[PDB]
Amino acid sequence: MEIDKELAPQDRTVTVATVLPTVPGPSPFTIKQPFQSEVLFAGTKDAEASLTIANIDSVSTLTTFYRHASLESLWVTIHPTLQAPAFPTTVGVCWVPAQSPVTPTQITKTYGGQIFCIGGAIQTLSPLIVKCPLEMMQPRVKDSIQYLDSPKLLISITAQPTAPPASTCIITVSGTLSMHSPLITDTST
Amino acid sequence: MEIDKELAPQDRTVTVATVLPTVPGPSPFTIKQPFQSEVLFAGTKDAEASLTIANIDSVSTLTTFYRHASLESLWVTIHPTLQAPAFPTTVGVCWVPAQSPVTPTQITKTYGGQIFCIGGAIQTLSPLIVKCPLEMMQPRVKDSIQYLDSPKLLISITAQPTAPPASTCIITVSGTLSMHSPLITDTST
Amino acid sequence: MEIDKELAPQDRTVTVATVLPTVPGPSPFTIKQPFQSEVLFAGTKDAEASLTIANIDSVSTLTTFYRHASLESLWVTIHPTLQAPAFPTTVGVCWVPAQSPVTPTQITKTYGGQIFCIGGAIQTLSPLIVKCPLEMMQPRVKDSIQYLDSPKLLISITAQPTAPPASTCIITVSGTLSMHSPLITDTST
Amino acid sequence: MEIDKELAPQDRTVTVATVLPTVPGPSPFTIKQPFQSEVLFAGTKDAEASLTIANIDSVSTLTTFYRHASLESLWVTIHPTLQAPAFPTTVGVCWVPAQSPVTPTQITKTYGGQIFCIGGAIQTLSPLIVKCPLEMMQPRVKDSIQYLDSPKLLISITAQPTAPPASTCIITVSGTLSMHSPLITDTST
Amino acid sequence: PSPFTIKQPFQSEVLFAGTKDAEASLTIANIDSVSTLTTFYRHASLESLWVTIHPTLQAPAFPTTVGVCWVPAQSPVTPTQITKTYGGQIFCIGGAIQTLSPLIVKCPLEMMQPRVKDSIQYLDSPKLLISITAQPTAPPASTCIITVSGTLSMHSPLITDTST
Amino acid sequence: PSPFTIKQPFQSEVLFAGTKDAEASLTIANIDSVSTLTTFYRHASLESLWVTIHPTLQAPAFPTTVGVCWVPAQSPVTPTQITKTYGGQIFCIGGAIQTLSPLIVKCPLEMMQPRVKDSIQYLDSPKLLISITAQPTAPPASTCIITVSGTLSMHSPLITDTST
């Protein structure tokens, strides 16, 4: 059967991060929490965006109150809008560790870097998905220390010269994270 | 589920290369480093390209510090832009050993030779890719000697008469390198 | 996954050729050589072409110097151009033994005969392939004698009334052949 | 990989024919001969067709020299032309035993009856084919007697009002014949 | 699993001294040659490291007091106190002894954090201290060149712009 | 089968320095002493190699800045950047320290192609870089001599005119 869900996984390679093992002791209980964070309403003008995932509101807030929290799964979705057909848009995407100094401008010079045309031609409007390869990133987003290779997302938008009246597509990033160890603070709000 | 990739593998055949063996002794420490290299912003005018992989930005750069470098995987990807739907474009492509006397215009007279129409609301804009058949070539882009069959890339662009405002598609070339035995030089920058 | 390669194999039947067996003796070494020969740049005007494959330059030259050479594999490819979408073209194709007196005009009255619309509508721009069925042809293209049932290719083009500014598609034929027994002649050029 | 063929098999059911046994004795030498027959250059105006396969050019011709001829396979193919994209066309089709009183206009009132829209940038131009269900009919197109259920083909064309310059699609009929026991006649020509 | 590292050596010009008195506090992981090699990796450790003092022909005419000392990044030491700290030592580059193996001073990585690029920021990586005291009636050009060499052990590719 | 090689040592005068500033980029397999020994063989590898700086009596009166650096033929380095590259190092030859074993600088063949003559042309054979900076008010004669010695491991006779 069909599935309105097209996905373009990023070329990869083997690269690890060094993570802090826990001190010897008793395993704490862990719970998982998922989310979807708005990243950008594009298509109207060329624009770009780079962002350390570990720092967006959705994460920041779910983690308030816990000392540690890693990322179980993470990806970004491109949701084509109703303006996408009449106005084909170019979107660039790349998952990269916080420490990589690349800018969206150079997505195409970067290894995993990808580029898509959104709308305007046969099969272009299914929503797109690029799973982030935590396999080669730094999954931890809250720990006893701050890491510098947590996931960072690079997005590049190249809009129509004669632009659309509104965003041709929405980009959200979503995933789910695990956390444990309560952060003993003021709970009264 | 659907994947946003289209493959146009080159017709192949047996034809091999020869290479010398690093000096007897202990296997030297070796790294692997991947890359994507901007090769062409096509679509606006017709153009050619005779690229000796061995010395394209990303590669020359990477290898810059080693005396030995072999290619573990190589391919060219054609990312269609937002102008692709409005402006079909003929793109030719051929993988050939550096020392093959062919010119882009001759892609169609050469065995592997391949050409496609990219664009138009009628066709699919999935990025199109031609993994390069290194078995057919000479994988060593850097050694103690000058091989003459390193891979060479042939690209032919035929653009719309009433051409587009900007490039209808981008051509990158990605791969992974296996370099070793460092070559002394200015580390300054 | 997807593959920019659509193929329409020809209806077939069982029909053999009588081939000259070699004289009793020692097997000679055999090598294979492949190729791609330009057949026609169509779409601009109605035109047609019929040709004994065994006689095209690419073959003629590879075989210079050998006494025997059969065809290991052979097919024809239709490569849609950037004009194909804006200008749908009708292409006819048929593999037939040299001895068949059919003309491209009557491809449709001939058994295997095929007809395609190129471009202009959904899924029309993938390059087309008709493997030649040597199974029912005369594979030998250079021997101790000339045969009359070697492969012959028939092509028919029916262009738009209001024609395109340039060829809507390229037709190349490609394949690979085996050869042996050197032809003792003047090698000095 | 993709194949440029689309099948529209006719809804079926049990219903058989009867046939007489060639005179007792030794099996007679028998040949098989295939064919493709031009049946209709449709698209420009509406039209019908009540074809008794038994006597269409290719068949009558082939059988011309035998007293017995059975059909081993039969089908109709609809090859869309270069005008198909610009001009959709309704094509009706039905396989029926010669002695079934149906007229093309009645395709839709008959069991197997089938009709499709051929053309328009929206639909696929893959040649469409209806293998004929000979089990349902009378395969003998030539015998010592006159069978009344040989296959009959019904075609109905409904053309664009603002009709096209030329036929939007061609209809052939191909098959393979099994004739035997030669019938004496003028071999002259 | 397993690593798959490479080792890469270097020599970095860090100071042309002798023209005027001068001080210097260098966090190694930031010196050009390093920040350059490491550019494409996620981890890089130092397998060996030292400072070298190449002397020019100015030396004989203009003797120079040169002090250097290896220390771990978060050591509170200032180049003025080289001789008060362990690794430290001072030299004279002049019309006397100069270049019986362009004086090197091996940095004792056993005493610090060799890691110079990781998933995190370390504070005890190698730091180099330099104190110069020159002729009052100064020389025309630099009296000596100070480099620091060693070799790196990097692994795990940092995905970035490979262009250049 | 088996080899049947011989080893032959040498010292080659490559530069008389000290009279004027000067640069030099020497592809070892081409220096006289070598192109000479190798003359009768089809293969020759280097088993050891280094540069030596013999100083004259001019040295004391006219100190000279002398830099040298070993590198593999296809290294893009220019003698001006000796101190920016690993092997590299600079000296002072003068009225101070000079000749506590006529300073040598071992070439690290582990880091290059020792083969200097083969069935083919290699590009990473040893190259020697030299940078000289002399007294403005120059000396009368050369301040020091620069040779490079080592030993060769040749085999397989190259059939030629044995006459001389």
Side-chain angles (χ1 to χ4, degrees):
Chain A
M1 210 158 178
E2 212 42 58
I3 341 87
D4 217 33
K5 210 170 228 114
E6 182 115 334
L7 74 124
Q10 199 160 97
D11 317 303
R12 8 137 50 81
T13 203
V14 41
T15 193
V16 228
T18 31
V19 281
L20 248 15
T22 52
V23 327
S27 274
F29 318 64
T30 327
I31 41 144
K32 289 179 196 166
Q33 275 274 1
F35 62 99
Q36 178 147 132
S37 198
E38 267 165 26
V39 182
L40 184 41
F41 285 71
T44 4
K45 59 216 122 238
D46 312 49
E48 40 143 278
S50 359
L51 83 187
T52 26
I53 261 79
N55 286 164
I56 28 111
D57 219 311
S58 316
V59 175
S60 117
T61 68
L62 297 214
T63 65
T64 300
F65 296 116
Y66 302 82
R67 314 227 264 116
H68 318 265
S70 263
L71 269 172
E72 225 74 333
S73 50
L74 162 71
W75 69 87
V76 47
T77 323
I78 308 208
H79 304 82
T81 216
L82 83 172
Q83 286 295 206
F87 293 104
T89 311
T90 288
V91 193
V93 176
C94 204
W95 282 118
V96 97
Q99 39 187 181
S100 194
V102 237
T103 144
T105 331
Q106 40 219 243
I107 289 185
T108 28
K109 304 217 225 146
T110 307
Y111 181 61
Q114 239 151 345
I115 278 303
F116 328 85
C117 181
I118 308 289
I122 59 170
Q123 168 45 110
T124 27
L125 317 172
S126 266
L128 232 9
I129 313 264
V130 194
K131 280 220 171 166
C132 169
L134 317 309
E135 295 86 34
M136 77 196 56
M137 296 257 153
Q138 234 298 200
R140 305 194 109 134
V141 311
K142 189 139 161 180
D143 217 37
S144 269
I145 187 31
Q146 359 198 24
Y147 299 90
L148 0 92
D149 26 0
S150 11
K152 184 195 220 206
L153 173 89
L154 294 181
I155 303 299
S156 108
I157 303 308
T158 322
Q160 217 79 230
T162 39
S167 350
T168 58
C169 69
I170 328 250
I171 283 125
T172 89
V173 90
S174 353
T176 126
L177 30 71
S178 99
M179 36 212 223
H180 62 17
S181 309
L183 193 235
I184 332 83
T185 173
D186 169 357
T187 58
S188 290
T189 229
Chain B
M1 229 154 340
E2 253 301 275
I3 352 81
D4 199 12
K5 268 164 160 114
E6 201 143 51
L7 324 190
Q10 238 193 237
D11 312 300
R12 86 194 39 224
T13 194
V14 208
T15 176
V16 61
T18 32
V19 300
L20 57 68
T22 302
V23 204
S27 290
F29 326 80
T30 166
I31 21 64
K32 271 177 191 173
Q33 206 83 208
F35 64 93
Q36 176 153 100
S37 167
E38 260 175 23
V39 158
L40 198 37
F41 279 0
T44 14
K45 17 177 227 89
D46 322 46
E48 291 187 352
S50 232
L51 278 35
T52 329
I53 303 303
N55 19 263
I56 69 200
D57 35 300
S58 289
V59 168
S60 92
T61 279
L62 249 13
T63 93
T64 268
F65 294 117
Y66 312 69
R67 342 186 266 122
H68 297 125
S70 211
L71 237 6
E72 295 254 319
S73 69
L74 202 233
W75 76 92
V76 49
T77 323
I78 300 179
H79 316 66
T81 215
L82 75 142
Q83 295 290 192
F87 297 93
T89 310
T90 319
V91 183
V93 123
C94 202
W95 280 122
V96 119
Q99 97 296 41
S100 168
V102 188
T103 158
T105 9
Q106 318 179 112
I107 292 180
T108 35
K109 275 134 146 266
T110 315
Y111 188 53
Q114 213 157 183
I115 82 93
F116 350 73
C117 164
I118 272 95
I122 300 319
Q123 99 117 11
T124 355
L125 310 197
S126 307
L128 178 62
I129 113 191
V130 176
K131 179 183 293 65
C132 166
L134 322 107
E135 319 93 37
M136 223 124 321
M137 340 225 125
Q138 178 40 287
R140 325 262 256 229
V141 257
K142 191 138 161 196
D143 225 58
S144 293
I145 75 226
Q146 187 69 269
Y147 296 104
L148 342 112
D149 25 17
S150 130
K152 184 155 106 153
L153 213 210
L154 294 209
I155 287 74
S156 116
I157 302 319
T158 311
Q160 212 59 43
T162 51
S167 353
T168 52
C169 72
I170 290 163
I171 287 101
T172 74
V173 172
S174 348
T176 307
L177 283 167
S178 199
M179 350 190 267
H180 75 241
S181 259
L183 132 93
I184 312 221
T185 166
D186 196 23
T187 14
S188 127
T189 211
Chain C
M1 210 158 178
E2 212 42 58
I3 341 87
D4 217 33
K5 210 170 228 114
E6 182 115 334
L7 74 124
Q10 199 160 97
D11 317 303
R12 8 137 50 81
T13 203
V14 41
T15 193
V16 228
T18 31
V19 281
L20 248 15
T22 52
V23 327
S27 274
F29 318 64
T30 327
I31 41 144
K32 289 179 196 166
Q33 275 274 1
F35 62 99
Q36 178 147 132
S37 198
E38 267 165 26
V39 182
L40 184 41
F41 285 71
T44 4
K45 59 216 122 238
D46 312 49
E48 40 143 278
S50 359
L51 83 187
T52 26
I53 261 79
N55 286 164
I56 28 111
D57 219 311
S58 316
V59 175
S60 117
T61 68
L62 297 214
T63 65
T64 300
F65 296 116
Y66 302 82
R67 314 227 264 116
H68 318 265
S70 263
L71 269 172
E72 225 74 333
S73 50
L74 162 71
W75 69 87
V76 47
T77 323
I78 308 208
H79 304 82
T81 216
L82 83 172
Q83 286 295 206
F87 293 104
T89 311
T90 288
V91 193
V93 176
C94 204
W95 282 118
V96 97
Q99 39 187 181
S100 194
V102 237
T103 144
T105 331
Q106 40 219 243
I107 289 185
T108 28
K109 304 217 225 146
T110 307
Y111 181 61
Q114 239 151 345
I115 278 303
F116 328 85
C117 181
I118 308 289
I122 59 170
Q123 168 45 110
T124 27
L125 317 172
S126 266
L128 232 9
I129 313 264
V130 194
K131 280 220 171 166
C132 169
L134 317 309
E135 295 86 34
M136 77 196 56
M137 296 257 153
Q138 234 298 200
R140 305 194 109 134
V141 311
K142 189 139 161 180
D143 217 37
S144 269
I145 187 31
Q146 359 198 24
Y147 299 90
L148 0 92
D149 26 0
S150 11
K152 184 195 220 206
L153 173 89
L154 294 181
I155 303 299
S156 108
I157 303 308
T158 322
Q160 217 79 230
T162 39
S167 350
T168 58
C169 69
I170 328 250
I171 283 125
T172 89
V173 90
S174 353
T176 126
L177 30 71
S178 99
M179 36 212 223
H180 62 17
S181 309
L183 193 235
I184 332 83
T185 173
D186 169 357
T187 58
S188 290
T189 229
Chain D
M1 229 154 340
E2 253 301 275
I3 352 81
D4 199 12
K5 268 164 160 114
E6 201 143 51
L7 324 190
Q10 238 193 237
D11 312 300
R12 86 194 39 224
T13 194
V14 208
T15 176
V16 61
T18 32
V19 300
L20 57 68
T22 302
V23 204
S27 290
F29 326 80
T30 166
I31 21 64
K32 271 177 191 173
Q33 206 83 208
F35 64 93
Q36 176 153 100
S37 167
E38 260 175 23
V39 158
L40 198 37
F41 279 0
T44 14
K45 17 177 227 89
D46 322 46
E48 291 187 352
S50 232
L51 278 35
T52 329
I53 303 303
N55 19 263
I56 69 200
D57 35 300
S58 289
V59 168
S60 92
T61 279
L62 249 13
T63 93
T64 268
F65 294 117
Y66 312 69
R67 342 186 266 122
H68 297 125
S70 211
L71 237 6
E72 295 254 319
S73 69
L74 202 233
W75 76 92
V76 49
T77 323
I78 300 179
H79 316 66
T81 215
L82 75 142
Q83 295 290 192
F87 297 93
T89 310
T90 319
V91 183
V93 123
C94 202
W95 280 122
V96 119
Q99 97 296 41
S100 168
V102 188
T103 158
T105 9
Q106 318 179 112
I107 292 180
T108 35
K109 275 134 146 266
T110 315
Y111 188 53
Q114 213 157 183
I115 82 93
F116 350 73
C117 164
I118 272 95
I122 300 319
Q123 99 117 11
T124 355
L125 310 197
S126 307
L128 178 62
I129 113 191
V130 176
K131 179 183 293 65
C132 166
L134 322 107
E135 319 93 37
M136 223 124 321
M137 340 225 125
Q138 178 40 287
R140 325 262 256 229
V141 257
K142 191 138 161 196
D143 225 58
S144 293
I145 75 226
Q146 187 69 269
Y147 296 104
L148 342 112
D149 25 17
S150 130
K152 184 155 106 153
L153 213 210
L154 294 209
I155 287 74
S156 116
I157 302 319
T158 311
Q160 212 59 43
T162 51
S167 353
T168 52
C169 72
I170 290 163
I171 287 101
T172 74
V173 172
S174 348
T176 307
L177 283 167
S178 199
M179 350 190 267
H180 75 241
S181 259
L183 132 93
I184 312 221
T185 166
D186 196 23
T187 14
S188 127
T189 211
Chain E
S2 158
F4 92 151
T5 24
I6 23 73
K7 282 176 177 162
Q8 277 280 181
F10 66 96
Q11 170 145 305
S12 193
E13 272 171 7
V14 300
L15 187 65
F16 288 73
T19 355
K20 43 184 92 65
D21 298 35
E23 273 190 53
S25 269
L26 316 191
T27 1
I28 302 310
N30 291 163
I31 200 46
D32 32 278
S33 286
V34 151
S35 47
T36 264
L37 289 164
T38 71
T39 291
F40 298 112
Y41 305 69
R42 278 231 253 154
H43 313 98
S45 216
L46 270 172
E47 303 268 296
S48 64
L49 158 95
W50 69 83
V51 53
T52 358
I53 299 179
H54 320 272
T56 77
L57 77 200
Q58 292 307 346
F62 299 98
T64 300
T65 292
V66 175
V68 293
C69 180
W70 280 117
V71 120
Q74 93 280 40
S75 167
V77 179
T78 144
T80 84
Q81 35 210 236
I82 284 192
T83 31
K84 271 145 144 236
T85 113
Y86 193 53
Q89 86 200 247
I90 264 143
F91 297 79
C92 177
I93 287 69
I97 236 234
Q98 52 78 35
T99 224
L100 210 154
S101 189
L103 9 277
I104 66 299
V105 177
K106 264 231 206 284
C107 171
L109 310 135
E110 322 95 37
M111 232 112 329
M112 32 194 64
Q113 190 46 217
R115 290 195 157 284
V116 296
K117 213 214 201 90
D118 223 47
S119 282
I120 62 234
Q121 180 83 75
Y122 300 92
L123 354 136
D124 44 4
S125 125
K127 189 178 187 211
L128 197 232
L129 265 23
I130 306 172
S131 150
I132 309 312
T133 297
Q135 216 57 50
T137 27
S142 256
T143 219
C144 65
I145 318 203
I146 308 180
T147 82
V148 358
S149 337
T151 87
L152 284 168
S153 197
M154 4 207 259
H155 67 80
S156 277
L158 164 59
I159 323 91
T160 205
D161 182 2
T162 8
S163 147
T164 51
Chain F
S2 158
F4 92 151
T5 24
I6 23 73
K7 282 176 177 162
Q8 277 280 181
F10 66 96
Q11 170 145 305
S12 193
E13 272 171 7
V14 300
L15 187 65
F16 288 73
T19 355
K20 43 184 92 65
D21 298 35
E23 273 190 53
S25 270
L26 316 191
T27 1
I28 302 310
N30 291 163
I31 200 46
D32 32 278
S33 286
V34 151
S35 47
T36 264
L37 289 164
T38 71
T39 291
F40 298 112
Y41 305 69
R42 278 231 253 154
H43 313 98
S45 216
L46 270 172
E47 303 268 296
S48 64
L49 158 95
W50 69 83
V51 53
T52 358
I53 299 179
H54 320 272
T56 77
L57 77 200
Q58 292 307 346
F62 299 98
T64 300
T65 292
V66 175
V68 293
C69 180
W70 280 117
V71 120
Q74 93 280 40
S75 167
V77 179
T78 144
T80 84
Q81 34 210 236
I82 284 192
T83 31
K84 271 145 144 236
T85 113
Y86 193 53
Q89 86 200 247
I90 264 143
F91 297 79
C92 177
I93 287 69
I97 236 234
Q98 52 78 35
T99 224
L100 210 154
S101 189
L103 9 277
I104 66 299
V105 177
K106 264 231 206 284
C107 171
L109 310 135
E110 322 95 37
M111 232 112 329
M112 32 194 64
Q113 190 46 217
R115 290 195 157 284
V116 296
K117 213 214 201 90
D118 223 47
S119 282
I120 62 234
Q121 180 83 75
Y122 300 92
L123 354 136
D124 44 4
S125 125
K127 189 177 187 211
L128 197 232
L129 265 23
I130 306 172
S131 150
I132 309 312
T133 297
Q135 216 57 50
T137 27
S142 256
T143 219
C144 65
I145 318 203
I146 308 180
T147 82
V148 358
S149 337
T151 87
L152 284 168
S153 197
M154 4 207 259
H155 67 80
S156 277
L158 164 59
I159 323 91
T160 205
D161 182 2
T162 8
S163 147
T164 51

